[PDB]
Every structure is written in C-alpha cells, then in structure tokens.
C-alpha cells in the first residue's frame, strides 16, 4: 500500500497522477480520465473492445496495469475525430453499417488505425478479415465490418 506517481500522455494531453499499482489501464482511462470510449467486455484479452493504441502498437488496455504505461503515449477512439469531422475509418464504418451495439467499435477502430496511417498495405476482403480477427463482435457477422474496412482503404489509396 503505497501509491505510484504516474506520468502519461493521453491523446496529446499530458497527465500527472498517483495511482495504486494494481489498477488496470482500462479502468484508469475510464476513471478518472473520463474517456468512456474504451469499452470492456471479456476480461482476459479476447473481446477486443478493450483495445487501445499504446506507443503506436495496438494492445489490450485490460492485460496491462495502468502503472505500466508510465512515460508513454496512449491513444483512444476519442482521438480519431478531429474538428467535428469523423476520421475516414469512422465515416466508412457508418457508410457500411459496420456496427450495431457500439462495444466492438473502439476495439476494431483502434486496431485498424496504425494499419491505416501507414502507407501499406491494401486491405482486401481476405486480408481484411485476418486484420480485425483479433476483435470479437456479436451483432454484425463481420461481413459489413470487412466490407467497411475495405471501403476505407479505397478512398484512401486508389481514390478516384
């Protein structure tokens, strides 16, 4: 029982706070940082929603103690939209109706983000399925998600 002084940059914003070590990063991000965007479904790195960008790499915010993120950059689904506009991924996710409840949306979107931002590769239906596969959904059947991701990557590259 002795709190640890943590320093983390969330969505560009720096933070300084005492946390007890045992607090999971997911719960840290939701409380008191009050970014409910990150969602928790399973409890052992499966569900997907959990997923956040840590230092450029998508990792589960739920198999990582908050204290382990000290002096590191973290990005959540909150950081996608910039100035009212929805980031291309979100825009195409709506264009193809790639979501129904909401839970498996932070997870997929953040998994797809660095993949998008880096110039390669294309994502075709087959390679698209393998990409999102690290995230589970109980509403869409992925069919539309797989269709959604592909659309996002066409307006990206071969754009007209």
């Amino acid at each position: 029982m002795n709190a640890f002084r943590l320093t983390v940059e969330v969505n560009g914003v720096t933070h300084a706070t005492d946390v007890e070590p045992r607090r999971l990063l997911a719960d840290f991000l939701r409380d008191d940082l009050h970014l409910r965007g990150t969602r928790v479904g399973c409890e052992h790195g499966v569900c997907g929603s959990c997923t956040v960008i840590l230092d450029g790499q998508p990792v589960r915010s739920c198999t990582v103690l908050a204290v382990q993120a000290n002096n590191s950059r973290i990005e959540t689904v909150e950081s996608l939209q910039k100035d009212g506009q929805l980031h291309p991924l979100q825009r195409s996710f709506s264009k193809c109706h790639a979501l129904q409840c909401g839970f498996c949306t932070s997870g997929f979107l953040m998994t797809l983000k660095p993949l998008y931002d880096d110039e390669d590769v294309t994502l075709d239906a087959t390679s698209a399925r393998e990409a999102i596969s690290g995230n589970l959904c109980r509403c869409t059947g992925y069919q539309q998600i797989v269709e959604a991701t592909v659309d996002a990557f066409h307006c990206r590259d071969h754009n007209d």
Partner: protein, 287 residues
C-alpha cells in the same frame, strides 16, 4: 475482475532487478508483457507481494546472428518474431510458429522470455524451439546457468527455474544448408490454444536421402515432447508416403494426452496426428 493489492518497482538493469525481488521477496514475482500474469491477477489466481517490471531494462530485446547460434533477448516480443532478421532458409521456422499465437494485440506485448518461464502445456514457442534444440541462458545473482530446452520444460505451468534466476537470452543452433521446416496447428478457432499441433524439420542428403531430422509435439503431455524414435524411422530414408505415415504412427504410440472440453484423450493423441504427417510433408518442397 479486479486484482489483489501488490507493490510495484521499475527495474533499471539486470542485477538491480535480480536484487529488488530477492529481498522483496519470497513470493515477489517479475513482470514483462503481463499477458499471462495480468490475466491471472484479474482472476485472482496468483497473489504476489510485489512486482518488478523488468520491461524497461535496455539490453534485453536484441536480435543477433552470434557465431554458430542465433541470440534472442528474453524481452523480445512475438510481434518481432514475425517480422525480423528471420531470412536465409533460417526463418528458420519461428515466424510461422509465432503466427499461431493468438492475435496481433497480444503478440505486441508478449515476450519470448516469459512465455517460456510460464510454460503452458499448449505454449507454441516451446514446441517449435525444442525442435531447434534450444539453449536458454538464465542469469541469476550467484552465477549464470544455461538450460537446454529439454530440461527447462518441466511440467504444465512449471519450469526448471529456481525462484529468482531470470531468463536473459535464448540461443538456437543455426541449421542446416539446406533443409525444410514447417509448423502446423489445429484449433477450433484460429489463434486459439490448439487441440494438437506439430513441429517437424528435415535436412536432406544430395539429393533425396536424409541426414538429420527432429520432431516435436503440442498437446502431448504437460509439455512439448521429442519424438526421438520417430526421428530414427525417418533418418537414412527415401522420405516416401510410407515412412512419413509410419513415423507419425509411431510418433504418437507413447502419448498420454489429458482430456479437455474440446478434446477426448485418444482424439487428442489421434490429433497429434497428421499434424506430424502434413508438417513433415511441408518440410519437403525443394526445401
């Protein structure tokens, strides 16, 4: 869902770490990726006194072609094992075998070191590494031990590491110029812990004869298993579909699989398989 209370210290280097837990101590544990320890804490299935985060020690995530071996630091993520030096018909087999481990988001923080010292009976890296005759250097306070992979793997969730004694590096006999290596796995869902899987490697004598071959098994007992006598069946042979099938049939006859909700004892063993049969098949293709 919530872990128990425990204390936490960031390790600055190897020795300073080895010290920090010792006096910790008794039931103080180290933490790298978290991908097995943290889930266990969420289930309150392990309640340590303090954690020592070695994950920030600078000289531990290296890849090196060192001499006759290949050196791999313990903090090397699986994510890297998929995309690395791994070339030269000396892949040698890893990126294919590390590809079966769950999903990118886990592979992104998991480490080779921890995965070994944890040692799940379905842990993939041990199976494939034992086929490569691995060599783990576990530095501790008193000295520096070197454990062959046959000795390291004790049981399910159990390794031959005395409390302390941190795995620092993993080395592999480089192999074979030239040869073929393949790994396959069966699971109801891709990326899940397998029912049964195999790791087999063959080296060929100009042109069709064979000079050395090594085979291992996933989901055999409580650990990865050498199919030593199945290897003798192969060696000096034509490598037809009359010795592969025969090797496989004898690569199983001694197993004691443990039944699960997904697996019946014989099924499991009968799913040790043809994992052997098609892995040996894929070992051979001009390779």
């Amino acid at each position: 869902m919530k872990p128990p209370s425990f204390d936490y210290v960031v390790a600055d280097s190897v020795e300073h770490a080895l010290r920090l837990l010792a006096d910790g101590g008794d039931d103080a544990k180290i933490i790298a990726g978290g991908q097995s320890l943290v889930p266990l804490l969420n289930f309150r299935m392990s309640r340590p006194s303090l954690l020592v985060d070695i994950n920030r020690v600078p000289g531990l995530a290296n890849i090196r072609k060192s001499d006759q071996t290949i050196a791999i630091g313990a903090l090397t993520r699986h994510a890297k094992l998929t995309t690395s030096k791994t070339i030269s018909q000396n892949l040698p087999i890893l990126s294919e075998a590390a590809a079966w481990i769950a999903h990118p988001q886990i592979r992104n923080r998991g480490t080779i070191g921890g995965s070994l010292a944890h040692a799940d009976a379905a842990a993939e890296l041990p199976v494939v590494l034992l086929a490569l005759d691995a060599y783990v250097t576990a530095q501790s306070l008193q000295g520096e031990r070197k454990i062959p992979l046959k000795e390291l793997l004790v049981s399910h969730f159990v390794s031959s590491i005395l409390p302390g004694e941190l795995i620092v590096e993993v080395n592999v006999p480089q192999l074979p110029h030239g040869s073929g290596a393949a790994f396959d796995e069966f699971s109801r869902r891709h990326g899940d812990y397998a029912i049964g899987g195999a790791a087999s490697i063959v080296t060929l004598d100009e042109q069709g004869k064979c000079s050395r071959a090594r085979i291992t098994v996933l989901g055999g007992g409580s650990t990865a298993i050498r199919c030593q006598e199945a290897e003798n069946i192969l060696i000096d042979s034509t490598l037809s579909s009359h010795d592969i099938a025969a090797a496989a049939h004898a690569a199983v006859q001694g197993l004691d699989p443990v039944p699960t909700v997904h697996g019946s004892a014989q099924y499991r063993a009968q799913v040790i398989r043809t994992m052997v049969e098609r892995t040996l098949a894929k070992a051979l293709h001009r390779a």
